[PDB]
Amino acid sequence: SIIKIDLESKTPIYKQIADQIIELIAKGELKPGDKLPSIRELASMLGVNMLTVNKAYNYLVDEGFIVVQKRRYVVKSEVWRNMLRVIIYRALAS
Amino acid sequence: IKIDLESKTPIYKQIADQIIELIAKGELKPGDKLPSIRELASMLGVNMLTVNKAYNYLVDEGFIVVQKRRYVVKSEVRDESWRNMLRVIIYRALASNMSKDEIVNEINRVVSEVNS
């Protein structure tokens, strides 16, 4: 009920998981250092296969919002503009 | 586009960020098209598995879109996909210890900037 899986959105499930984990980090409901649920504990929480959560947790690792602390997932601690620049550009070019 | 083989950043992420740079820096732009998965996988010395992933990373982020069998810089605005990307921008901003006063102060600074 914290992470809403939107089954008819066209955002892939793993990406809605990741997006919402970022929102929760943004909202501060997940402070830094906060260990995350297991891949298995979160999949079952959501009704989802571990693979989709795996993909979600890895997306968050490459993007730099969580980190692995000997095989457990933890919110990191530090430091999207190019994203803005491309949509203004896409905006004004209309 | 150059692949730093020794960096800890993943290859697909390297490719993606560099292309995003081109889209952002105007050097790549709405309606433009990108090399085939294989053309790029052959320009670079990289197998097509991680090139495919790079492209599908740009698709999910919202940057490009398959049009015929072609990966194409997104041109379409006013839709809901437009609005999602914004939310991601402010959401990722807030999640990097930025004020809300801060972020939108800096949003205006980039809109004005490129109306060049």
Residue numbers in the entry:
A (entry chain A): 3 to 81, 85 to 99
B (entry chain B): 5 to 120
From the paper:
A crystallographic analysis of YtrASa yielded a structure at 3.0 Å resolution. The 14-kDa YtrASa protein crystallized as a dimer with the asymmetric unit of the crystal structure containing a homodimer with an exclusive α-helical structure. Each monomeric unit displays an N-terminal DNA-binding domain harboring the typical GntR-like wHTH motif (α1–α3) and a short C-terminal E-O domain, consisting of two α helices (α4–α5) that mediate dimerization, which is a typical feature for YtrA-like regulators. Upon comparing the YtrASa structure with that of the only described bacterial YtrA-type crystal structure, CGL2947 of C. glutamicum, major structural differences are observed despite the similar topological organization. The distance between the two monomeric Arg42 residues, located in wHTH domain, amounts 36 Å, which is similar to the length of one turn of the DNA helix. This is only about half of the distance between corresponding monomeric residues in the C. glutamicum YtrA structure. For one of the YtrASa chains, the α5 helix could not be modeled due to poor electron density, likely explained by a flexible behavior of these C-terminal helices within the crystal. Furthermore, the alignment of individual monomeric chains from within the same dimer demonstrated that the E-O domain has an asymmetric nature. Although these observations might be ascribed to the crystal packing and are not necessarily biologically relevant, the short length of α4 underlies a compact E-O domain regardless of its exact conformation and a shorter distance between the two monomeric DNA-binding domains in comparison to other YtrA-like regulators.
